């Protein structure tokens, strides 16, 4: 029996979504978002790794 040893290196996929709303239902498709300091931000990081 002959044994060959090879391999690789892969990266998991992880993102963020700028959730327009609290409770994190809808992400953001834009590129420039303009708020006032008093407004809250609702974000997170998701994992399709």
């Amino acid at each position: 029996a002959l044994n060959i040893r090879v391999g690789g290196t892969g990266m998991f996929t992880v993102r963020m979504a700028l959730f327009q709303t609290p409770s994190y239902t809808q992400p953001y498709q834009g590129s420039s978002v303009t708020l006032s300091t008093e407004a809250f931000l609702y974000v997170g990081t998701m994992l399709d790794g």
Binding site: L2, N3, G8, G10, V33, L35, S36
Partner: protein, 272 residues
Amino acid sequence: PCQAHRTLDEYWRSTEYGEGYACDTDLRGWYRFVGQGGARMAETCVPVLRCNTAAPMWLNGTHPSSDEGIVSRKACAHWSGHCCLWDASVQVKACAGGYYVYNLTAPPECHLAYCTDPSSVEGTCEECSIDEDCKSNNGRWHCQCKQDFNITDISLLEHRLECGANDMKVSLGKCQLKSLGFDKVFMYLSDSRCSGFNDRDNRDWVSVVTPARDGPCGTVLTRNETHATYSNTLYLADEIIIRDLNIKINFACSYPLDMKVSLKTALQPMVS
């Protein structure tokens, strides 16, 4: 030869036509049979009274394969119930692609003409990939790959491993394996239910897809403080059984645990 010839778009030369009188003595040069009559001229002595002629003719022997050069055949003529009663000189030459060119001469007397069988119009060569030459063997076109693809040992075998996020897959260009001596391969994981399959992206490949999980195909996950590796074993053989030259591909690719994100949308504050 292959570039200097005349065509004959005639549907009446087929071996299905009822009967006729026309005889060929004005046929002079190299010809490319094209149309519903046929692309190749007959291989067996067709029964008498066919091909729009009382005494149809045929080529004895077989059509040459690809890459042979000039070949000489003696076309026979069937008449009076005795196959190959009259004889003529013909010169058959294959060509790059699915056609032939013939040195068509005048038979000794009238009432002699050539036929065309349906031949292998169904058989095509586009099914051969771009790296597969349009070769032929005994008149049947096959896909012989690059002769340059010649590797003797097995250590030099090419392994296309990309470690995708969801799963890892090991690919093998089937040209190198067919040059290695396996007309058909059998990629067996730790569980043989994980048999490989063919796929084409830039050339011919056969590949095994192993999910990047612990156990789904007997996959062994081994995670240390830094990374996490999936280690399994693959098995190759040209047949169902193995008697010598055991093949074991112990591939393992590892994913990270510390890793980063930044948002793709600019944000702008405004305050009084």
